[PDB]
Design a binder for this molecule. Structure first.
Ligand SMILES: Cc1ncc(COP(=O)(O)O)c(C/N=C2\CC(C(=O)O)=C[C@H]2C(=O)O)c1O
Ligand SMILES: Cc1ncc(COP(=O)(O)O)c(C/N=C2\CC(C(=O)O)=C[C@H]2C(=O)O)c1O
Ligand code: FES
Lengths: 461, 462
């Protein structure tokens, strides 16, 4: 189930990784590779590289490994002769689903449906989840504006040549700092880093400011309240402005916590008010839980913290859920087939794994565990913040979804590199932030393992 | 390895499928579902449904199953205890690849690299393959324009808010009848059916006509070279037209054989001439082999029939290749990391399957078989086109990648329902066409078996 603690043999990346990285660099730009891994020996919270180093993984493959490496319940799943077909016979799910398709969804995604969302469509990643959510919303908004009336074949002629009115000028509203994926629709709503965006054609869609909170939160209540109201007002202005530009906002997309943009949090009150604005202006409210979903904030979906019976119209997911997809309200159900469609629509082998994952999360009480291990981790980070204010500021988090800021990008990268050499895998976000994305089997004792290591690092820094 | 004939028991969809379909229709529009399947009992070319029916599968999951259902070598893979980790520990490939990642690529995709393309990036589907091919092309074009100089301050600031100059107004040129995927970039180059495009915002990019060939090819040689020539002229006119409208064509995307648009073919000469038009105007030439790739035309990539040493700059693939991705020339390699990137970049579990799949295609010479069994197929249809000219016209194909047209939509659908009830599954492209997408273990006698069944269907048709 897990190892005792990290065990380091070489610097990271070590010689075998550098050689493998050299080989990979022949066929593609491999500059992003951190090191090469031995997934066969990785277990629980621990990632093992090809040089025999064993690191406590607080990054979890960009927050996509739900219950650790080589989990024995998932090993057993694959060993079962009845499951071999799921792995070698991949169906075109939208036309030829396998027999157990509904029953496996009942054991997995449907058992954690968000409140008010009866509909579910599966997708293979977070980008095509969000893209097909955009299209679902565009179709819903046009269906609002046309009744009753069928497809005018002026629309049917124009749409084949990328022309109005068949191809409308609707917009999706998004937030500075957002990250929603990399295909060209998602990218327009992404506003994280210049390197993600530069040289790519885009859409003229409204971009709103995301609240920047001041820490400690308990000393800045009035100012954080004012900041959020400012952002809410600008959101509303943009909807009216782009309505007058004939670029009508059909939906609003937001992350419950902005990840790649620098772990930007906002109050539950902000999101409830934003959901209200979306309803008021007839915009679909699209909540992207690709990164916050799967339980690390202490609830299965992070938007559950908002306390709403009607939290959103559409909610997209991926990563920890193994498969992508989106839940939505019944009124967004497409009237006709083949409008939301592609070859694979996910992968039933991922659903097979996800049903066992969800069963482990529920039986091992891992939502409550994440709330607890996260409080322990955050308490420790606040302690380190008080002891090393020249290095650590803006400690923040919900559940294990935690982060802090360092002085600059150069310092962030040195600390990550040292921590890796001391047996801890960390990830970055934003300009200068260090983020924590532990798997759901991260325990309070793993928090202490990290904090002790980081204490000695900051002492010697 | 295979059954030796269809085995029917009910109409299709049978009772259990209709029940499963009603259940599924509760949580999503299920109007597209044909029937539910028992893949555990499916074998080779035969798809078994939940009502016990066994049909000859000439659609192969929209042309995505490479070597038939439940192949014993793929079965033998999943049962190796060394491979368990591969299925349950999915990495973020761009940052933390597994130890065997490069070698498994050598065993698989790299051993079928097209001519002139040393670079490879993997992706999970055909849509993000083409999307990232587009972005690779846009980055390369801007790199030409800016030379070896850094991003400007104004570019870095305006790209964050969707504005020029950071976000250029480049275009990708595509063809009518093209299908390149459903995400919003892909969709703007797709021109297949109106039901794919309506109510979705798009890009003002150039759309060129694809040549509509008259058949028999024997009889219309000069009409067809004239048709192909004027299409080539409109392509060139659009590039010139969009450069002045400050929407410079950075690349051209085309399928070697259009699929979803109605199985539109064109001569090898046409693609060679289009290849040179692209180069001549400094456009990247992007060849979409998502559907044609994998060997069904008798060569692993369809474009291999063109006989070029420089067939393309970028080539995307998916479906039969299990994983997606794209090959490209070295000069298209991104200068900096994190520009072409996402969490998974495919899936090592698919690479593990593809390596065994590619070994079997070579060891058992399935490319020859596809050219051969495709000939028997196409020969048979031509005979049935002669004996029934009121139903079947324009019998075309390359390898097993064949199609034909019917008078109208209703006869198309009726023939498919009849044929499926008689034990053979066919797909349909366009408004009134019937296509053949057999797996690569489809053989001589599977041709004949379909031919004999469709024969009797033909003799009893109203
Ligand atoms: C809220 C959210 N929405 C959509 C997506 C898109 O999913 P896919 O990656 O499956 O297409 C993601 C994925 N997250 C990252 C991808 C990435 C990169 O540089 O591409 C850096 C990661 C990061 O979180 O910083 C995401 O977190
Ligand atoms: C030539 C072609 N290109 C892209 C796609 C889109 O693939 P996906 O359906 O996997 O997104 C398809 C199907 C297709 O035939
Ligand atoms: S776009 Fe989601 S897997 Fe290709």
């Amino acid at each position: 189930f897990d190892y005792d603690g990290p065990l380091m043999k070489t610097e990271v990346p070590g010689p075998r990784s550098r050689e493998l990285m050299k080989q990979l660099n022949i066929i593609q730009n491999a500059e992003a590779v951190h090191f090469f891994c031995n997934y066969e020996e990785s277990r629980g919270n621990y990632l093992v590289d090809v040089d025999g180093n064993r690191m406590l993984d607080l990054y979890s493959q960009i927050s996509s490994i739900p219950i650790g490496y080589s989990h024995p319940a998932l090993v057993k799943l694959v060993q079962q002769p009845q499951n071999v077909s799921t792995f070698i016979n991949r169906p075109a799910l939208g036309i030829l689903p396998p027999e157990n398709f509904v029953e496996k969804l009942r054991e997995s995604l449907l058992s954690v449906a968000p409140k008010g969302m009866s509909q579910l469509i599966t997708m293979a990643c977070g980008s095509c989840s969000n893209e097909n959510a955009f299209k679902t919303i565009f179709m819903w908004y046009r269906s609002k504006e046309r009744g009753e009336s069928a497809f005018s074949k002026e629309e049917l002629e124009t749409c084949m040549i990328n022309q109005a009115p068949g191809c409308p000028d609707y917009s999706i509203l998004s937030f500075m700092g957002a990250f929603h994926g990399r295909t060209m629709g998602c990218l327009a709503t992404t506003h994280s880093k210049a390197i993600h965006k530069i040289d790519i054609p885009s859409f003229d869609w409204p971009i709103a400011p995301f609240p920047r909170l001041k820490y400690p939160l308990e000393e800045f209540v009035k100012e954080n309240q004012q900041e959020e109201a400012r952002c809410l007002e600008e959101v509303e202005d943009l909807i009216v402005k782009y309505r007058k530009k004939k670029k009508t906002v059909a939906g609003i997309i937001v992350e419950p916590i902005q990840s790649e943009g620098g772990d930007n949090h906002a109050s539950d009150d902000f999101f409830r008010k934003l959901r209200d604005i979306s309803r008021k202006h007839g915009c679909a409210f699209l909540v992207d839980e690709v990164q916050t979903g799967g339980g690390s904030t202490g609830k299965f979906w992070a938007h559950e913290h908002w306390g709403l019976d009607d939290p959103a119209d559409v909610m997209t997911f991926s990563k920890k859920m193994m498969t992508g997809g989106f839940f939505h309200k019944e009124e967004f159900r497409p009237n006709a087939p083949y409008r939301i469609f592609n070859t694979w629509l996910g992968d039933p082998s991922k659903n097979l794994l996800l049903a066992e994952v969800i069963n482990i999360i529920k039986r091992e009480d891992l939502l409550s565990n994440a709330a607890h291990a996260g409080k322990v981790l955050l308490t420790g980070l606040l302690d380190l913040q008080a002891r090393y204010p020249q290095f650590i500021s803006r400690v923040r988090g919900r559940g294990t979804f935690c982060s802090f800021d360092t002085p600059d990008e150069s310092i962030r990268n040195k600390l990550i590199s040292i921590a890796r050499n001391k047996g801890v895998m960390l990830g970055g976000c934003g300009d200068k932030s260090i983020r924590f994305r532990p798997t759901l089997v991260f325990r309070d004792h793993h928090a202490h393992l990290f904090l002790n290591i980081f204490s000695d690092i900051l002492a010697d820094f």
